[PDB]
Amino acid sequence: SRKTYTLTDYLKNTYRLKLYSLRWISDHEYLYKQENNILVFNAEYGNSSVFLENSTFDEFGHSINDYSISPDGQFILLEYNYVKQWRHSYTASYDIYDLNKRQLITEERIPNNTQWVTWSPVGHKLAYVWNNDIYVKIEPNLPSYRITWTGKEDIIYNGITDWVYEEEVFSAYSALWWSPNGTFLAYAQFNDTEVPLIEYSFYSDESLQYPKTVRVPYPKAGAVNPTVKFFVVNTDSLSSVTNATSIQITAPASMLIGDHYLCDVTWATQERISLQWLRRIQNYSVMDICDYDESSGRWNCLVARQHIEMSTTGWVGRFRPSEPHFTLDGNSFYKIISNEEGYRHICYFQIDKKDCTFITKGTWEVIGIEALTSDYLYYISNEYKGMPGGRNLYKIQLSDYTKVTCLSCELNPERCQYYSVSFSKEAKYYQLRCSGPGLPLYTLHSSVNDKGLRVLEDNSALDKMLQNVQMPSKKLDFIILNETKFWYQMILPPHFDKSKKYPLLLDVYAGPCSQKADTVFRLNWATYLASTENIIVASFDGRGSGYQGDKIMHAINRRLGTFEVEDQIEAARQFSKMGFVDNKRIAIWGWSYGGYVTSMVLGSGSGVFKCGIAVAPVSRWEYYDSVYTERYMGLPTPEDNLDHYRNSTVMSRAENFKQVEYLLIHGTADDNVHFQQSAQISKALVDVGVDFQAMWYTDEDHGIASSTAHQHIYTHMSHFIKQCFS
Amino acid sequence: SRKTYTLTDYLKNTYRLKLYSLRWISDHEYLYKQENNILVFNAEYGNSSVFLENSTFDEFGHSINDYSISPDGQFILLEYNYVKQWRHSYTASYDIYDLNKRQLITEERIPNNTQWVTWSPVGHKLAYVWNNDIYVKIEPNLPSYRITWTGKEDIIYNGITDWVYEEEVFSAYSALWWSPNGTFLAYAQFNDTEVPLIEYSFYSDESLQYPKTVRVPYPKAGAVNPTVKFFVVNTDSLSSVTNATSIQITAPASMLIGDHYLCDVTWATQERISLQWLRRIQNYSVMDICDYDESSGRWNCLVARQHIEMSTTGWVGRFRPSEPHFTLDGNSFYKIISNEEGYRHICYFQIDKKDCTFITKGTWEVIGIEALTSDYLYYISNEYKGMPGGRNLYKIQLSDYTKVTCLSCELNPERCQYYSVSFSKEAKYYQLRCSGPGLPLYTLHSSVNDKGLRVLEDNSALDKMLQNVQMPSKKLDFIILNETKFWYQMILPPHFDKSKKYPLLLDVYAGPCSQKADTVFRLNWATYLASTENIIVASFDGRGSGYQGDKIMHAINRRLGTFEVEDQIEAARQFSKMGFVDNKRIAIWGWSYGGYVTSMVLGSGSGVFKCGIAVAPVSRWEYYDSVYTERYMGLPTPEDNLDHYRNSTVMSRAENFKQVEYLLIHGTADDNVHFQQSAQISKALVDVGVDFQAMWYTDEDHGIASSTAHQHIYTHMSHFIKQCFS
Ligand SMILES: CS(=O)(=O)c1cccc(-c2cc(N3CC[C@H](c4cc(F)c(F)cc4F)[C@@H](N)C3)ncn2)c1
């Protein structure tokens, strides 16, 4: 009949998904963006006077990438000149516009090439980082006070993360934290002095005669890590003549004995800062809780307020130890930690009592703690219907742990089983974001007794477009192995017919704590392959997968490249038994870690897979970075785990690629998984006389995300699959 | 019927071509190597007592890759620890073995990592370069005297060439020249101080954690060139206490006005050194003739001894100004230079008279002056049968220029049309090397009256094997354009049938002064394509091609990427009208410059070519080196030829690759045509949404010549072609 979801569609983005990106500026109001004008909305009723006219900056003289209003309500920060660096890092330019006097602030402006700017959480105080140094701006139109003086490009970082900390521990460039009322500014300092550099060519525009060598501090597994220091400064007692004292918090002694990280910093009260440290062996983590000493002017990290979080069967936390949530007085906190049963749940801690009390339990896990009031703790979890791929909002009554309510489960069960939530400032209102299996739906609620105020975005437009196009359907379900359920999804072509045999693509990640089998509604390349090309795209969450407890997640501890790949092969066989699957036509592909799994599967000699694609794969663990690799693999030394580092490379599997058709893709400017890794793969396959397909993407990093390269690659991959399959 | 010439054959070298590599040690004798033992032969009769036993060095303790006997006859130099650098450069270790006391000399030995070693042309004196400095060894058993003290790695070169001089001017690492009796050692010094570096990753064995950045001094078109100086030292008057005086020859004044090169040095007598220099605009070259002054102890380059060689229609000489050949007394010389008519012929010059006299003329060219006696000058030319693809040996009578004899033309016309020659020390005997169209044939002759002494290698073994296998035949011929003939060859399948339509591959180089249409017998990848796969591989020499005069060769002066690609397009079209050519199946491929012409041709939107392959192409001229690019293109400046530099890139033709199937291959460690060039091509084709195949070869340079990579690339290319063709 009518038209399908085509490749063009995915690349040219013809079927747009609507969102409702709001930002709460108080407990009663938010701003909704546009392409035109920031408007302000009243949560109770829905009325909305325009916040600031779209005309304000047509004759500003620059494209303005981003906006950011001070909490005072008195100023807008204006981001422009944005120059992307890593995943989160970038530089930019900045002007401050005073809402009151409808007037740009021109003197003492924030310098260009600024790495990071942040308001204080109450007033209009500014902290910005520039050339690796921290600067504070008490009033927007007044001068800046320098705070640190040791900023050195590529060497000493003040208030910002180095490459590895950005990627692997904080997930952010920022490494400064204001105190709740803005007296204190706490910051981290990282030292890359002795860290080796990864170096690679960047070619740029045709006009550049000589390729430039980019070089970045980057610790590969086992190499010299960056050192970290931590400080706090009073932003009220700085003068402009005395340079300014930063107070160092040190230790703790359980970390100073050897290599360590700082992995969490969370303010508690005006004068309590909580810090989490984690040993290089990411087995053992400590929480410190330090009060300010009015008297001495230094910070007391009182012994006996410290909290050990360890693991006997793996690493601490999902990717890092969880974040604590402090009650208003700051004398107790909730954080997610692993059960005695293996499951991640909420513990109630009293700041000077080591024995925490679990407030939630069960064979399911808590994803994140969303909000804390005086009577209710708010959280996302996968409890509903026993589906680890579902997400819902719950509240637990702080005075009776038996009384927990689902706030999202029932609003629309057929449409909505994957939720996320955004709360107003004292949590009197919340936006719920449903994201599947039906169309994304955005709605507004008031907390007083969880009354549904109104629908913010229903995507009815998209719904109207998508009824004249033959969409694929999705199936979530589980298969059993060794008395355990393992979840898996399948994207099914339209008019699916279980009496016909279909080609199957296995879409894999399989990295530690991953989940490819869930309820989110996704409009992507798989949608095209199923709808236009009649392929079954399938993903499977085997051992090492997350959100189902530690017996699963920790099965691959110290053993990457074993069960997770044994399980993906396992999945394939199982689907090929299902009757609707032509086993002469199973393929497999993955990006990143998924590339690694794919490669490792193709090299296994399973005989299951006719062909496969690996995009920007890891090829041996020693090439990837310290913080990530070590988390799961330990150190690549004889005394520790060198042996399995060695025994788990793609290269050693070279000879078995004779049995398969392989496509190896990689961007030359990958700062994350260096091209080196695909370079060693090809060298291996050349060395043992195996033919394969390749494609470098010049100057593209780990996302190969540019407009045209994104289109080129997907076009290229479609061609390879279609040929493997027709 | 029987077996064909298979791919495995070409790659595993199953049909071995026998050579006869001899080295003349005198006028009466030569050494023929083996895998066994160096024997000595007498040219007159052919008897041969073993020179030095094979067993002398089995218990040596190192693999011995090369040998070199002092002229004295008293020593052998033994090369080992060979470590390849660029095309000609390499390091090595060396031991000197005294023939007479049957004993290796072990004190004062030549240091390892030696960059170059050379005998004196008479005694047993040694000159060697180590750590960019020159050392002389009067006796092998005695200490070395240092000559230069300014050797700095990649900065100051003494007695050796930097990257660009090695590749583009000298075609050698060597930059010293002994005087004919060995009193004087002349040397060049190059200075790379302010030369930009090309930088790239080399990955090495899998064990290496971080990729190393190789970085080489490399002038791209328009960049800062290396400066050169010239010196001469007397090796009889060095003491061991006074450090040793090198006398510098400078100028000429017509060169010092700007950038220049040194491009030839040839000794004339014991006390005359001839030098050729060439302006950076390679339009205008000067020869200096400098005599040693007994009195002052310096060198007079007396003007009115200098000889200008220029070009009004292009560049000086083929790739460089030709080498002069001095008569015994040193008061006259012969060199090849371009006609009034445009053609390359021999001029007789009297060292202090400007007006040289042509001793040969005609619509053919002289290739190289082979030898000069008192009554005879010997040379190779393509005069026989008007065939620019033929080579033959001629002698011209010095006393009557009308009397010139062909010595090679007639020995076997059917089999032999491509000759080269090696002469004994006073030219009393010559070995002729016939190399096609029949099988390579090696014979010995005596000069006295050019009598054929005997056949040294007929390759009858190879002939016997090759009569069991369906080989392809080859056709040489010409087409006419613009009232000019232009030669072309075709490798034709066995059992060729003009009533059948075959797929055609066009094998292209087409670079300045190239010749792909010739008489040489080649056993390579085209042989397989024609034999096994029934493909016509054809090559064509259009404009810009050499050995046919300057009308042709200089047609692409200041205009690379024009006529040479228009002419390959033109040959294809003409071939496709020939009747036996399926024009739904014409392909094209090239390496280096040929990769560039290939890409340029595919981008042209000709509509002739279904598909193509480019190996390691140039992509825009500003990316390739100064000496070569500028020779043909001038300087990439607004005042000069920037406009056509820009107007002639592959990238700008990106859009047109939508119409073809493209395969782009490049080695990541190409020091010659930097990867950068293919990286910019792929970027352009991604930018405009054009699909193509690629393959990088990690750590392979311009030859992609290592055993495994060679095999992999040709296999990969046969797959692409087979597919484009069935
Ligand atoms: C006759 S001589 O005195 O020994 C003698 C003296 C000087 C030079 C040369 C000579 C050089 C070359 N080349 C071959 C073409 C090479 C080339 C061209 C190109 F377009 C590329 F992209 C890459 C590449 F390697 C060129 N770099 C050297 N060929 C022949 N002769 C020879």
PDB file of C-alpha atoms and ligand atoms in Angstrom, chain B residues 87-88 163 165-171 263 318-323 509 511-513 547 591-594 596 616-618 621 624-625 628 631-632 670 672-673 677 702, ligand 1:
ATOM      1  CA  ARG B  87      63.149   5.445  -1.234  1.00  0.00           C
ATOM      2  CA  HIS B  88      66.983   5.347  -1.203  1.00  0.00           C
ATOM      3  CA  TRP B 163      63.865  14.157   2.350  1.00  0.00           C
ATOM      4  CA  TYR B 165      66.720  16.187  -2.156  1.00  0.00           C
ATOM      5  CA  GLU B 166      66.678  12.384  -1.823  1.00  0.00           C
ATOM      6  CA  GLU B 167      63.342  12.107  -3.603  1.00  0.00           C
ATOM      7  CA  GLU B 168      63.370  14.907  -6.107  1.00  0.00           C
ATOM      8  CA  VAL B 169      66.880  16.006  -7.059  1.00  0.00           C
ATOM      9  CA  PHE B 170      69.527  13.307  -6.496  1.00  0.00           C
ATOM     10  CA  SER B 171      67.492  10.067  -6.324  1.00  0.00           C
ATOM     11  CA  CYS B 263      71.280  19.346  -8.794  1.00  0.00           C
ATOM     12  CA  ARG B 318      63.632  15.569 -17.968  1.00  0.00           C
ATOM     13  CA  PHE B 319      63.407  15.593 -14.170  1.00  0.00           C
ATOM     14  CA  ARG B 320      66.711  17.487 -13.744  1.00  0.00           C
ATOM     15  CA  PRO B 321      69.424  18.974 -15.955  1.00  0.00           C
ATOM     16  CA  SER B 322      71.325  16.076 -17.499  1.00  0.00           C
ATOM     17  CA  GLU B 323      74.858  14.959 -16.400  1.00  0.00           C
ATOM     18  CA  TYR B 509      50.259   7.183 -14.812  1.00  0.00           C
ATOM     19  CA  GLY B 511      52.660  12.199 -14.998  1.00  0.00           C
ATOM     20  CA  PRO B 512      55.194  14.634 -16.518  1.00  0.00           C
ATOM     21  CA  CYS B 513      57.727  12.769 -18.736  1.00  0.00           C
ATOM     22  CA  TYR B 547      60.827  10.933 -24.940  1.00  0.00           C
ATOM     23  CA  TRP B 591      48.838   4.839  -8.293  1.00  0.00           C
ATOM     24  CA  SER B 592      50.534   8.121  -7.177  1.00  0.00           C
ATOM     25  CA  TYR B 593      50.226  10.658  -9.987  1.00  0.00           C
ATOM     26  CA  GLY B 594      48.143   7.990 -11.752  1.00  0.00           C
ATOM     27  CA  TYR B 596      45.472  11.699  -9.219  1.00  0.00           C
ATOM     28  CA  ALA B 616      47.687   6.955  -2.761  1.00  0.00           C
ATOM     29  CA  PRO B 617      46.677   9.843  -5.024  1.00  0.00           C
ATOM     30  CA  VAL B 618      47.725  13.448  -4.983  1.00  0.00           C
ATOM     31  CA  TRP B 621      49.192  20.311  -5.559  1.00  0.00           C
ATOM     32  CA  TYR B 624      52.904  17.727  -2.537  1.00  0.00           C
ATOM     33  CA  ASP B 625      56.495  18.781  -2.277  1.00  0.00           C
ATOM     34  CA  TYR B 628      58.510  18.331  -7.831  1.00  0.00           C
ATOM     35  CA  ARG B 631      58.995  22.128 -11.471  1.00  0.00           C
ATOM     36  CA  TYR B 632      55.766  21.882 -13.398  1.00  0.00           C
ATOM     37  CA  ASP B 670      52.960   7.614   3.462  1.00  0.00           C
ATOM     38  CA  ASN B 672      55.732  10.931   0.144  1.00  0.00           C
ATOM     39  CA  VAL B 673      52.063  11.534  -0.735  1.00  0.00           C
ATOM     40  CA  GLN B 677      45.551  13.974   0.477  1.00  0.00           C
ATOM     41  CA  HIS B 702      53.884   5.026  -0.726  1.00  0.00           C
TER      42      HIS B 702
HETATM   43  C1  LIG C   1      67.152  10.440 -13.964  1.00  0.00           C
HETATM   44  S1  LIG C   1      67.772  10.722 -12.430  1.00  0.00           S
HETATM   45  O1  LIG C   1      68.954  11.552 -12.537  1.00  0.00           O
HETATM   46  O2  LIG C   1      68.081   9.461 -11.783  1.00  0.00           O
HETATM   47  C2  LIG C   1      66.657  11.500 -11.572  1.00  0.00           C
HETATM   48  C3  LIG C   1      66.888  12.679 -10.839  1.00  0.00           C
HETATM   49  C4  LIG C   1      65.841  13.283 -10.120  1.00  0.00           C
HETATM   50  C5  LIG C   1      64.555  12.714 -10.126  1.00  0.00           C
HETATM   51  C6  LIG C   1      64.356  11.539 -10.857  1.00  0.00           C
HETATM   52  C7  LIG C   1      63.080  10.835 -10.997  1.00  0.00           C
HETATM   53  C8  LIG C   1      62.067  10.922 -10.057  1.00  0.00           C
HETATM   54  C9  LIG C   1      60.903  10.198 -10.335  1.00  0.00           C
HETATM   55  N1  LIG C   1      59.817  10.200  -9.465  1.00  0.00           N
HETATM   56  C10 LIG C   1      58.675   9.414  -9.924  1.00  0.00           C
HETATM   57  C11 LIG C   1      57.453  10.243  -9.632  1.00  0.00           C
HETATM   58  C12 LIG C   1      57.488  10.555  -8.142  1.00  0.00           C
HETATM   59  C13 LIG C   1      56.142  10.917  -7.661  1.00  0.00           C
HETATM   60  C14 LIG C   1      55.293  11.708  -8.432  1.00  0.00           C
HETATM   61  C15 LIG C   1      54.027  12.003  -7.970  1.00  0.00           C
HETATM   62  F1  LIG C   1      53.207  12.767  -8.703  1.00  0.00           F
HETATM   63  C16 LIG C   1      53.614  11.517  -6.751  1.00  0.00           C
HETATM   64  F2  LIG C   1      52.392  11.831  -6.321  1.00  0.00           F
HETATM   65  C17 LIG C   1      54.449  10.716  -5.975  1.00  0.00           C
HETATM   66  C18 LIG C   1      55.727  10.409  -6.446  1.00  0.00           C
HETATM   67  F3  LIG C   1      56.562   9.643  -5.729  1.00  0.00           F
HETATM   68  C19 LIG C   1      58.569  11.589  -7.884  1.00  0.00           C
HETATM   69  N2  LIG C   1      58.522  12.064  -6.520  1.00  0.00           N
HETATM   70  C20 LIG C   1      59.900  10.907  -8.173  1.00  0.00           C
HETATM   71  N3  LIG C   1      60.809   9.455 -11.482  1.00  0.00           N
HETATM   72  C21 LIG C   1      61.817   9.404 -12.376  1.00  0.00           C
HETATM   73  N4  LIG C   1      62.942  10.091 -12.128  1.00  0.00           N
HETATM   74  C22 LIG C   1      65.388  10.951 -11.568  1.00  0.00           C
END
